Design a protein around this ligand. Structure first.
Ligand SMILES: C[S@@+](CC[C@H](N)C(=O)[O-])C[C@H]1O[C@@H](n2cnc3c(N)ncnc32)[C@H](O)[C@@H]1O
Ligand SMILES: [Zn+2]
Ligand SMILES: [Zn+2]
Ligand SMILES: [Zn+2]
Length: 215
């Protein structure tokens, strides 16, 4: 049962994952009703995986496209022992397709740094905790992170990692791929998003067409 230092946002070590956009001023309309949410299903920003800025957004406080910025994580997640896969994360309540679940947190390091760490600190680990970020940068959650680090791999996932431009910085959120009832274990496909460490592991996802191996 594995220990780490819990953080509320990424720790930037030797790099800065600048995106090179701004998420700038959509043509979404602020709905007249107080509790109807704006910037939803046709928001200019959303369509390029960029969050709105609270300074620019026409929808003001009803802007529902600032989910990573505002740390709008689901509150129903639970760490549990998952047969054959150490610890896992399940949801205690239903979640709907496309819904934002949590940001993936860790230390943001260059590929070179993460490689050094793999040799000098992690070379003996039996569990791996790292996401590709972009341009030869990685989110390393071996030492610091949040509960997203415990989310297991599936060859038939119910969630995915999406890279977003947030105030000009790339950050990664987990989103539901499909509806899931209460008690469902969260999973994503590591072969897409997880950093290739060169140490392969048997896959126990239990899918009919399981690829047999993670990485
Ligand atoms: C990001 S961690 C997930 C948390 C891990 N289960 C634990 O208890 O700390 C990834 C590690 O979990 C295990 N794991 C995740 N998914 C698996 C799977 N589908 N089959 C076998 N092992 C898995 C592997 O050891 C993998 O290196
Ligand atoms: Zn919008
Ligand atoms: Zn907006
Ligand atoms: Zn599998």
């Amino acid at each position: 049962a594995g220990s780490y230092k819990k953080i509320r946002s990424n720790v930037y070590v030797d790099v800065k994952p600048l995106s090179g956009y701004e998420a700038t001023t959509c043509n979404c309309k602020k709905p007249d009703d107080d509790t109807r949410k704006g910037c939803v299903d046709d928001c200019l920003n959303r369509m390029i995986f960029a969050e709105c800025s609270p300074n620019t957004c026409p929808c003001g406080e009803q802007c529902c496209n600032q989910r990573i910025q505002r740390h709008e994580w689901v509150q129903c997640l639970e760490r549990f022992r998952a047969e054959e896969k150490g610890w896992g994360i399940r949801t205690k309540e239903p979640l709907k397709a496309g819904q934002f679940i949590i940001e993936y947190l860790g230390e943001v390091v260059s590929e070179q740094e993460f490689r050094n760490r793999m040799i000098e600190q992690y070379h003996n680990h039996s569990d791996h905790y790292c996401l590709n970020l972009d341009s030869g940068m990685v989110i390393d959650s071996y030492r610091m992170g949040n509960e997203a680090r415990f989310i297991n791999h599936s060859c038939d996932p119910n969630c995915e990692m999406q890279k977003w431009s947030v105030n000009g910085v790339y950050r990664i959120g987990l989103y539901a791929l499909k509806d899931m009832p209460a008690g469902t274990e969260l999973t994503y496909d590591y072969n897409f998003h997880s950093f290739n460490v060169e140490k392969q592991q048997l896959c126990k996802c239990g899918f009919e067409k399981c690829r047999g191996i993670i990485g």
